[PDB]
């Protein structure tokens, strides 16, 4: 159960070469000698991608290309020139000032084929963004760290000193404000989206507590 | 004073074509057709970049490039590309499932070549620069720099500079005015020292003490 690729190529040597490269890339290559055979094959045995050699000038490639596109939206890679290997490049050491423009290699053909074939509170710490009921929140890095801290352990009272230590451990957080300022600001932005939800409770000298749902981390 | 680029191409049409495209990009192109000519040219008249076609007769470009790389670290682009296929495909509608496999065009290499190659404020792309050198400024530092330097000698209180940071929607920080000013001055003094940029007086405000900003 791997992606199958139909190679429409007349030249037998290159045809086999593309088969060798594609099969080695864990694909299922199939070769066709152009002509009438192509169309019914695409209808009965549809591939996941069509590698088509437009024998330019010819125009017979483009005509077949246009014919296939009429009844199917299967991706077609229109080969313009003659695909050749460059084994001279293999083993070549690339420095910091050595820029090698990509060749017209069967390797690069395989490469392009690979490219073509590819809790109301949600917090993503990979991109550092949060959302309440789907609505995005515009938070400063401190308001974010406090949001994730409280919402991860809901019903847990965090003292003002504890939250500071979560802000200290989080570089990308530099703050001249106080904890009370942030909590109000974060709550203000949360109440902007809801106003019907009890988000953060503040008991002086005791600490802050998240009184909403547990954040879902992505 | 523009970047000099050496083109090593044996094919005359593509050679002249690369010259035209590169010169149009405000560069200084020089074409060499033979492999025995380039090496002494790289010595006597060193270019800023070498556009080297991998496939030229007489001597292969790889033994040619290994030679240049031995006595210079000038950036070398290894070209394996040809002319572009216009007219044949001109007018064709390229769908989301239509992928064109074609060799690099002389337009594309010039594109790739380009990639390899006192106070001014461009409020468009939101950047600044002092004495040529660009400034890495946070949205608050930028807004503060423009506000202060637009009117040198004028005193803004911290209450007023807060009004500006509040009216700027690019600005979202956890820092105060005093920190941004300390920062903005720290980055300016990192460039050229002994030049007094911002003066801060408590209870009075802040004052830009240098030349005015040149906008856009």
Curated annotation (Swiss-Prot), chain A:
Organism, by scientific name, is: Escherichia coli O6:H1 (strain CFT073 / ATCC 700928 / UPEC)
**How is this protein named in the record?**
Transcriptional regulatory protein BaeR
A GO cellular component annotation here is: cytosol
Record-linked Gene3D superfamilies = 3.40.50.2300, 6.10.250.690, Winged helix-like DNA-binding domain superfamily/Winged helix DNA-binding domain
Q: Which residues carry this modification: 4-aspartylphosphate?
A: 53
Q: Where do the Response regulatory domain residues begin and end?
A: 4-117
Reading the lineage from the top rank, the first entry is Bacteria
Question: Which InterPro entries does this one have?
Answer: CheY-like_superfamily (IPR011006), OmpR/PhoB-type_DNA-bd (IPR001867), Sig_transdc_resp-reg_C-effctor (IPR016032), Sig_transdc_resp-reg_receiver (IPR001789), WalR-like (IPR039420), WH-like_DNA-bd_sf (IPR036388)
Q: Which Pfam families would you find in this protein's record?
A: Response_reg, Trans_reg_C
Swiss-Prot record, chain B:
Tell me which UniProt keywords the record has, alphabetically: Cytoplasm, DNA-binding, Phosphoprotein, Transcription, Transcription regulation, Two-component regulatory system
Ranges for domain Response regulatory: 4-117
Q: How is it modified after translation?
A: Phosphorylated by BaeS.
Q: Name the major location.
A: cytoplasm
A GO term, aspect molecular function: phosphorelay response regulator activity
Q: Which residues form the signal peptide?
A: none
Q: Which residues bind DNA?
A: 118-210
GO:BP terms for this protein?
Answer: regulation of DNA-templated transcription
Q: Which residues carry this modification: 4-aspartylphosphate?
A: 53
Its GO CC terms are: cytosol; protein-DNA complex
Q: Where in the cell is it found?
A: Cytoplasm
Pfam families assigned to the protein according to its UniProt record, in alphabetical order = Response_reg, Trans_reg_C
Task performed by this protein:
Member of the two-component regulatory system BaeS/BaeR. Activates the mdtABCD operon.
- Protein name per UniProt: Transcriptional regulatory protein BaeR
> What organism is this sequence from?
Escherichia coli O6:H1 (strain CFT073 / ATCC 700928 / UPEC)
Gene field: baeR
